[PDB]
Amino acid sequence: MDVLYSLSKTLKDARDKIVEGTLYSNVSDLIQQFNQMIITMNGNEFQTGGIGNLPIRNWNFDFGLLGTTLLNLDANYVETARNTIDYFVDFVDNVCMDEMVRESQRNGIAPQSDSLRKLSGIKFKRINFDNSS
Amino acid sequence: ESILKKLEDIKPEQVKKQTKLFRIFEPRQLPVYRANGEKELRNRWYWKLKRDTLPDGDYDVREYFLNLYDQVLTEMPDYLLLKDMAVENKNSRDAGKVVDSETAAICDAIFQDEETEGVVRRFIAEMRQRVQADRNVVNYPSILHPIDHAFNEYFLQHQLVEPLNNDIIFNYIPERIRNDVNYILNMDRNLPSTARYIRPNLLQDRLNLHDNFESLWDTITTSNYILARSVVPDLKELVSTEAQIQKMSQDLQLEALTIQSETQFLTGINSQAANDCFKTLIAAMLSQRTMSLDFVTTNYMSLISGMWLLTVVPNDMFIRESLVACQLAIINTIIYPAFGMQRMHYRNGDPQTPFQIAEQQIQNFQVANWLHFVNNNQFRQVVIDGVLNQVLNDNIRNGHVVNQLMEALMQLSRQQFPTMPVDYKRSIQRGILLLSNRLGQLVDLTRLLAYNYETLMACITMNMQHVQTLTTEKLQLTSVTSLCMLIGNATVIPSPQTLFHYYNVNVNFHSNYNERINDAVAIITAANRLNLYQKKMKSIVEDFLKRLQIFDISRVPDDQMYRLRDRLRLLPVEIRRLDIFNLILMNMEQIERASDKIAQGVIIAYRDMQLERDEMYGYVNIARNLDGFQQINLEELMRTGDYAQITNMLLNNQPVALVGALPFITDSSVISLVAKLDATVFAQIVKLRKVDTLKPILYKINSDSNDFYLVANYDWVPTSTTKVYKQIPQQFDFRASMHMLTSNLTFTVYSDLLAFVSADTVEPINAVAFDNMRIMNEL
Amino acid sequence: GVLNQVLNDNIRNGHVVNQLMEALMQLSRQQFPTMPVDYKRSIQRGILLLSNRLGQLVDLTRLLAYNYETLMACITMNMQHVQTLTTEKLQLTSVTSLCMLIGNATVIPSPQTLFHYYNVNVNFHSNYNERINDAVAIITAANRLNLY
Amino acid sequence: LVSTEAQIQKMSQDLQLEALTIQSETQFLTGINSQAANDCFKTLIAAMLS
């Protein structure tokens, strides 16, 4: 849950802060966190299940890191970041939906979807950051 | 250089060829005796150790078996052709052949012996080889002990040779060299289907010497740097130094009666320095060796050349102190005075470099953007073709960073320098003019550097680990100025022969590294599993480091070698070595028990026990097992040295079994057995408290005894109170020992695959870069 | 019946050196925020010089503790701990030499050396007690004989 | 004991003292020898015993 929230928070921050013309000093830490998320998620295969009418969806992560060269972000940087953020937002939304449509009598507080159960592994703890909600 | 001689003198791998079947046992004729001890007219063949030299003491026996493991590893071949071992079997009906000559000797001895059964002679007559030329196979008869057969069968079935063809040879070349359009490869041979080769063991560094082994890593990186220097091409058709100096003098407008900073701009501009800088940069990046920046703050041309250098080379390639000094000189001499900013008071040890502070503090977009790029210009760690590599930014590879730097410099030249005399601005402008008059040549130089770097990086087999080295390589900024000022338009790229030589040296070193790691790991694991608790393993690691051939073990302390031992101990053993050790562990008890020099123990019972009947001894006081007796471990007794228990048992006549590899005295005298001498060989243990001198008595009572008439004339079965824990030899069954050893009929093994590939280069003017444009485009 | 100054069981087995290593390993990873990088590197590499001898230092600690225990078994007078007027000066360069040069050759007191040490201690203790007895006897005799 | 020459070279290489600006460059590795190690061992154990 904390890892899923961290993914969603990172993507929201990327959408809000990665804008054309912004100083890189305004996104340096955000870019570092986003790249850490990219590294952690890279090479992992996920599946959001087909309970009900939810389509079964497969997710692969092979994204390159975000750049660190521009003093001020430009249109090309924003477009590349937009593509990556769109894929990640789709993945996160599908994972959240797959989790919301599931319930358990024995352990309801534990993750029910296999995607969120996989995100509860130790290797994904790196993605975790600010939990302010 | 001696380092290059050491690194290029490594041979690929010494190929081992088996000339004879490995053997630990041999048949031997022994006289046999009847149940009453009378000698039979017939003899009998028994299995006996060929080299019976097992030592006294269980610990010494385990050491002997470790040495045997080393011997078997030495004798294990990379490939085998049994026809080389094949010899004529004179008694074969079809005049066939057997392997090895020792088998033929056994066959001849058995066949000629009058006591051999006719069935065995028939069997020998049938022994011949079968050749399947269609399958390229041959089966040869061989006479081997089951342990010998196991070892030889493993050797036969676990050879290291694999088929070789033109496609394999071509794929041996690195994928990036083949995918490069600037090199044309060719072959003039069709390798036959019977060609073989041995793959190099290019496993990545399992010891992670880049982590926490800083002196060894310094040595490794120095060797890599020397090799990379040796293979970096020389710059051709450089601009004439005299003409370039004249042009620089005219641009700088040097005055005779005035002291000027611009004079120093001409310091150290020569082709030797240009080539030295090119080689140093490419070799340091390839070997991932940290560089040190040598410059004089009074030479501003050095500072502008340093701006270019910091633009192109990632800043992690330079030791931090030198990088900080160069950046501070650039900021306080060029950047800040241009913009009227106060001189930066930079603190030594600041978390931020001078360029980061300047980037925060500079309001000019071009200069600040260039500063930001320099700050964030890093290598990219990418696993290409299975090898970790440090990849330059694409803008560096295509040379666009030179355009960004030139925009920054042009913005600097336009500044007013409000707080400096006009001559200071004039000098800075003149230096910038010198650098900017060669903008196209600088783009060409950056592209050439990047292309040479990646082309020579394609030939690296070990991971390029980016870690700061203990010592650095000094780079003079005057050499950078020389390279910037004298580089022409001629494109120089590594020769295909140079690339192949570099790749072959790298492969040889990598294979040697992995093979020596395998040897050390096997030896350490075997010593641990053999419980050699008194063995100090420093020698093993010392031999390992000696055989790597690039370290001076006299400079390596013992603690470092033991840390290497600890790292080696965690690695798995190579499959062939592990299986050989498994065979040895399985069969070492049987190998030891076959020795005639030592016994497995002595049972001191204080009751009469009838001597066992065995055909090859007659009557013998041999114990097949230590059942129903308390056991005293002689090894533990010798290690601890406490003889209280053994003394108490010997003084109280309490039956016991002293267990441990012991030498024994073979006695055939019946009168000695009647005298009960075997029971008198243990008081010395109580007297001297030493069991190394213990040497029990093994009675061998049969008709060859002088007093056997006592046994014959009194229907008397000999009895003794002491028994020798010992085994009896296994009978040699000729038919059961025959094995059909199968191997390939014939093949040819090749060493240097790239010897079969002839490679040439396209015209250097037409050589292209990764982006399909010519590397150098200036007229 | 003899007072003895004994070490922590973690010193005796040398396990605590691991903690030391741990601690100074962390010191090798630290930033040293405002320290010059060359001096920082030198300090960190010296810290690692001591760190990478973890096994040797564990062996040295166990050896020193064992020798101390064995030779303390041969002490007959109470090991009273007092801060003495004059000290024994210990050069830390000698400590560095011991830490950086100790190998893996165990050396323990010889049985004859232990017996000689014990005999010397016993002789000194016995002489001390006998001379106390003589002094007390003579003083008491002089007082009871009224030898003012 | 570990060879004094090898350990001295290792320590010198790791410390890089010559590259620093330490007013005492030679005195750093002085006193590192087998005799000093033996003196330390004896001094420590003897002081603890006495």
UniProtKB/Swiss-Prot annotation, chain A:
PTM notes: The N-terminus is blocked.
Subcellular location: Virion
Region: Interaction with the inner capsid protein VP2, residue numbers: 62-73
Function, in words: Intermediate capsid protein that self assembles to form an icosahedral capsid with a T=13 symmetry, which consists of 230 trimers of VP6, with channels at each of its five-fold vertices. This capsid constitutes the middle concentric layer of the viral mature particle. The innermost VP2 capsid and the intermediate VP6 capsid remain intact following cell entry to protect the dsRNA from degradation and to prevent unfavorable antiviral responses in the host cell during all the replication cycle of the virus.
Family: Belongs to the rotavirus VP6 family.
Subunit structure: Homotrimer. Interacts with the inner capsid protein VP2. Interacts with the outer capsid glycoprotein VP7. Interacts with the outer capsid protein VP5*.
Note: The VP6 trimer contains a zinc ion located at the center of the molecule. The zinc ion is not essential for either trimerization or transcription activity of the DLP. Zinc-depleted VP6 has an increased sensitivity to proteases.
Descriptive protein name: Intermediate capsid protein VP6
Originating organism: Rotavirus A (strain RVA/Monkey/United States/RRV/1975/G3P5B[3])
Lineage per the UniProt record: Viruses, Riboviria, Orthornavirae, Duplornaviricota, Resentoviricetes
Shown residues within the full chain: 1 to 133 of 397
